[PDB]
Every structure is written in structure tokens, then in C-alpha cells.
């Protein structure tokens, strides 16, 4: 359930974020909020596009600790966002720590839900 919980937790954060919903141009009104759709990373062979299963990939850092990277999409009737997540096992919590998380919507500035501790000097 590692990747499943990671994805459920992440997509839930994205969906509830007012700014992200605005970037996705959600049809949110007095009758209710648009029901967004989510799926794994979109891949193509240049013939047709499809979503890959939701999964994370692992990569070791300089301290010998494993980081998990996961990409998925959130789609509204008008836009598709690409969400990137980096997480790492927490030595204190059950759930892993979210290290970096951003959302890319075409034509919009990359939006960080979780800004890394290690940030550009021009923060």
C-alpha cells in the first residue's frame, strides 16, 4: 500500500488546494465543486497516449537514504496538471515526509505545494 497511500495523500492535497483548482479552471460553483479525475503519468509512443499505473521510483541520496519520486496527473474538464512528488521515509512518523511537491499546468507558473528545505538562494 506504499504507493497507493502516497498517491492518495498527494492527490488529496492537490484537489483541495484552492490555487490549484483555479489553475485547472475548475467548474466550481454554488451547485458544487467539479469532480476532478486523476491517473498515473501519461506516456505516448507518438501514436496514442495512455496513463501508466501509479507507482514511485526509488533513488539513493548521498547519505544512503532512499527517496521516492512519483508523478501523476489531475484533470479537469479544461486542463491537465502534472504533479511531481518526492518523499522519503520518516524516522519519526509512520507516513513518509514529503520533500518536494509541485504542479505543472500548461501556461501557468509551476506551483509548489511543498517547497524543499534546500531552496534556491533567490527564495
Curated annotation (Swiss-Prot):
One GO cellular component this record assigns the protein to is:
mitochondrial inner membrane
KW Membrane (keyword) present: yes
A single GO BP term for this record reads:
protein import into mitochondrial matrix
Side Mitochondrial intermembrane, residues: 1-123
Tell where it localizes. Answer: Mitochondrion inner membrane
Q: Per the record's keyword annotation, is 4Fe-4S included, yes or no?
A: no
Which keywords does this Swiss-Prot/TrEMBL entry list?
Membrane, Mitochondrion, Mitochondrion inner membrane, Protein transport, Transit peptide, Translocation, Transmembrane, Transmembrane helix, Transport
Q: How does it sit in the membrane?
A: Single-pass membrane protein
**Cystine bridges: which residues?**
none
Which additional comment does the entry carry? Present with 3770 molecules/cell in log phase SD medium.
Say which family it is in: Belongs to the TIM21 family.
Q: What does this protein do?
A: Essential component of the TIM23 complex, a complex that mediates the translocation of transit peptide-containing proteins across the mitochondrial inner membrane. Required to keep the TOM and the TIM23 complexes in close contact. At some point, it is released from the TOM23 complex to allow protein translocation into the mitochondrial matrix. In the complex, it acts as an antagonist of TIM50 by reducing preprotein accumulation at the TOM23 complex and promotes dissociation of the PAM complex from the TIM23 complex.
Its assembly, as annotated, is: Component of the TIM23 complex, at least composed of TIM23, TIM17, TIM50 and TIM21. Interacts directly with TIM23. Interacts with TOM22 component of the TOM complex. Released from the TOM23 complex by the PAM complex, leading to protein translocation into the mitochondrial matrix.
Stated name of the protein: Mitochondrial import inner membrane translocase subunit TIM21
Amino acid at each position: 500500500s506504499g504507493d497507493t497511500q502516497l498517491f492518495n495523500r498527494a492527490v488529496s492535497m492537490v484537489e483541495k488546494n484552492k490555487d490549484i483548482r483555479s489553475l485547472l479552471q475548475c467548474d466550481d460553483g454554488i451547485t458544487g465543486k467539479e469532480r476532478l479525475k486523476a491517473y498515473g503519468e501519461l506516456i505516448t509512443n507518438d501514436k496514442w497516449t495512455r496513463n501508466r499505473p501509479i507507482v514511485s521510483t526509488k533513488k539513493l541520496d548521498k547519505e544512503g537514504r532512499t527517496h521516492h519520486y512519483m508523478r501523476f496527473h489531475v484533470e479537469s474538464k479544461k486542463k491537465i496538471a502534472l504533479v511531481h512528488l518526492e518523499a522519503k521515509e520518516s524516522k519519526q512518523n509512520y507516513q513518509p515526509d514529503f520533500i518536494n511537491m509541485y504542479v505543472d499546468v500548461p501556461g501557468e507558473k509551476r506551483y509548489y505545494l511543498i517547497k524543499p528545505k534546500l531552496h534556491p538562494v533567490s527564495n
